[PDB]
């Protein structure tokens, strides 16, 4: 299945089209020369501005190392990971095909082909950095969702998340590190020609199936689940604090209504709204924070029994003893709750904007990876059917199914895999 112009000496790990000792051509896989030049220039054009913006984010980190606390610290490791991603993807444009390609030799009648294996080549190091820091950036976004969860359900601060920072770094450089050592162990390194970098899941179907696309999908599922858990737990604790505030303000305002009122009628008509508010406030809610409302309701009861017996000033004296109980148990609890629940509102808004601005490029990359997963056999069959005479291999027997993949899809995949580093700048500036 491999031509004499594409054959390599064995036991070097070369495996293309499921046959040993073959490798895809370097300059042209199926695209045009001018189209490839435009794609390379476009990749360099996004790469330079991505490197500039991400270096601005890292310089903002360098001007003050303690500027960002650990509830938002993982965004700067996100930034440094994607700055290394953009740096490698710019090195790909600058070096063209001098690294992620083998050289031709007319004397041996061989053509330029994709480096695939160990050899003695920096493509190994390029794969290490690119795969490691891409997976690391995704895991760091997962860790940011985790840190928001720790600030949502088991509400912590910038101290308890610091005490778990060693384990966070262990994960965020362990799953990418172990996956990188696994892929380097199984000899599944490959090489790009469109961009100029080296990556896994390019010309092998399974490597893109369950070593690139599946981990990113798992990360997205975990992150969206934790984000939704945080949103639900924050808007349950917000409206349950909203009604308790409404029940308490309809108790404080009504207590003022009682105090400056006359007659034996409106004292009962106002206290009857106090008792209704107190019972609903007890249901919200810790044992002392329910026993307090229990002794408040009985205090309204003692005020309400005096009002029914036509004693107006005694209800004034009975209601004014509710002010001591309010201060003694609650009324510091609210502004402490309305601050811890409104910096969490703005943190939730920022993390929602960051998620909705980073996930969409990530979801586009996932979609294009799925598209390259689906039609691999059809694309290779069209390659073989179109490229038959000049390679002298036998032509396919049947099933043409002509389908040349579009430059738009792959350029989108290489576009949204680099714009993800832009999402840090919004939090930086």
């Amino acid at each position: 299945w491999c031509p004499r112009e594409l054959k390599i000496d064995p036991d070097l790990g070369y495996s293309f089209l499921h046959v040993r000792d073959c490798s895809p051509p370097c300059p042209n896989m199926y695209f045009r020369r001018e189209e490839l030049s435009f794609a390379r220039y476009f990749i360099g054009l996004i790469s330079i501005i991505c490197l500039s913006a991400t270096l601005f984010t890292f310089l903002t980190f360098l001007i003050d190392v303690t500027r960002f606390r650990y509830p938002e610290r993982p965004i700067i490791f996100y930034a440094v990971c994607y700055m290394m991603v953009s740096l490698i993807f710019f090195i790909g444009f600058l070096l063209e095909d001098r690294v992620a390609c083998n050289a031709s030799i007319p004397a041996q009648y061989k053509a330029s082909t994709v480096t695939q294996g160990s050899h003695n080549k920096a493509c190994t190091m390029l794969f290490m950095i690119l795969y490691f820091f891409t997976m690391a950036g995704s895991v760091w976004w997962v860790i940011l969702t985790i840190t928001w969860f720790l600030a949502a359900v088991p509400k912590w601060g910038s101290e308890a998340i610091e005490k778990k920072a060693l384990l966070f770094h262990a994960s965020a450089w362990g799953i990418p590190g172990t996956l990188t050592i696994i892929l380097l162990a199984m000899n599944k390194i490959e090489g790009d020609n469109i961009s100029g970098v080296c990556f896994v899941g390019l010309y092998d179907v399974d490597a893109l199936r369950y070593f690139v696309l599946a981990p990113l999908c798992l990360y997205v599922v975990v992150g969206v689940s934790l984000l939704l858990a945080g949103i639900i737990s924050l808007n349950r604790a917000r409206r349950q604090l909203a009604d308790l505030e409404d029940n308490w303000e309809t108790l404080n305002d009504n207590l003022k209504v009682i105090e400056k009122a006359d007659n034996a009628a409106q004292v009962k008509d106002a206290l009857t709204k106090m008792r209704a508010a107190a019972l609903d406030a007890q249901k919200a809610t810790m044992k002392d924070f329910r026993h307090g409302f229990d002794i408040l309701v009985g205090q309204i009861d003692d005020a309400l029994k005096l009002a029914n017996e036509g004693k107006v000033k005694e209800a004034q004296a009975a209601a004014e003893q509710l002010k001591t109980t309010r201060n003694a148990y609650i009324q510091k609890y609210l502004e402490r709750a309305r601050s811890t629940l409104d910096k969490l509102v703005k943190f939730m808004i920022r993390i929602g904007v960051f998620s909705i601005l980073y996930l969409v490029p990530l979801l586009v990359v996932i979609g294009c990876y799925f598209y390259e997963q689906a039609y691999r056999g059809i694309w290779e069959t069209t390659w073989i059917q179109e490229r038959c005479r000049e390679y002298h291999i036998p032509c396919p027997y049947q099933v043409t199914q002509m389908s040349r993949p579009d430059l738009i899809l792959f350029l989108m995949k290489y576009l949204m895999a680099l714009i993800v580093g832009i999402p840090s700048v919004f939090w930086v500036g």
Partner: antibody, heavy 124, light 109 residues
């Protein structure tokens, strides 16, 4: 088993007076409040009186204010309701109910045990 | 003063059906409503208290719900013995007890 028995109903003239009795077996009247609720023939329930034997916290409804009187005895474990100057629309069947005290489940439990309820009519 | 408007003044449901009775409170009475059953000729027996809790003795067919100032009694299965009058009571205080107008659940025919 805890139970309530009502007695005293019968035929009375307009403007007359009658005394109903509600006796409790089981619980004590000091640990529960006793309410009287009346049901007119062919109509719904309306609350007419209540008593708290722990301290005395009597209050009635607006239809019978200044016209009815309620009391209780802890020695005989009974609650009495007296009506003076009965109007013709006070004919009903009267029910005795038990309601707990704050806090906890006894108050949140509403009228739990009801008596048989006895019928009083105004004999024109 | 607090008025309970019990909307379906007469229901006609058959055996095994699902019965929904609603009750609207004028003021913001808390989750203190009680649903009562009265057979013709006898005294009321408590069915539901605190707008959600089933009484110890009544079948698990009955259930209660609260939505703000609206209160609902749902009977999931309607046995032939569950053909009586059903009343809605608000108890915000001892001296404020006002009942609803009542719903007579009759047999559909």
């Amino acid at each position: 088993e805890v139970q309530l028995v009502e007695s005293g109903g019968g035929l009375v003239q307009p403007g007359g007076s009658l005394r109903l009795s509600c006796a409790a077996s089981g619980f004590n009247v000091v640990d529960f409040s006793l309410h009287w609720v009346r049901q007119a023939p062919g109509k719904g329930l309306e609350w007419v009186a209540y008593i708290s034997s722990s301290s005395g916290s009597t209050s009635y409804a607006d239809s019978v204010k200044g016209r009815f009187t309620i009391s209780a005895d802890t020695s005989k474990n009974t609650a009495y309701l007296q009506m003076n100057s009965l109007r013709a629309e006070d004919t009903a069947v009267y029910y005795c109910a038990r309601w707990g005290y704050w806090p906890g489940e006894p108050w949140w439990k509403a009228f739990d045990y009801w008596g048989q309820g006895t019928l009083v009519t105004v004999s024109s | 003063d607090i008025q309970m408007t019990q909307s379906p003044s007469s229901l006609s449901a058959s055996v095994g059906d699902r019965v929904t009775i609603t009750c609207r409170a004028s003021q913001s009475v808390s989750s203190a409503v009680a649903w009562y059953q009265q057979k013709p000729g006898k005294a009321p027996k408590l069915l539901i208290y605190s707008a959600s809790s089933l009484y110890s003795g009544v079948p698990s067919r009955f259930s209660g719900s609260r939505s703000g100032t609206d209160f609902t009694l749902t009977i999931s299965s309607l046995q032939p013995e569950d053909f009586a009058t059903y009343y809605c009571q608000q108890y915000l205080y001892y001296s404020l007890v006002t009942f609803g107008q009542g719903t007579k659940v009759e047999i559909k025919r």
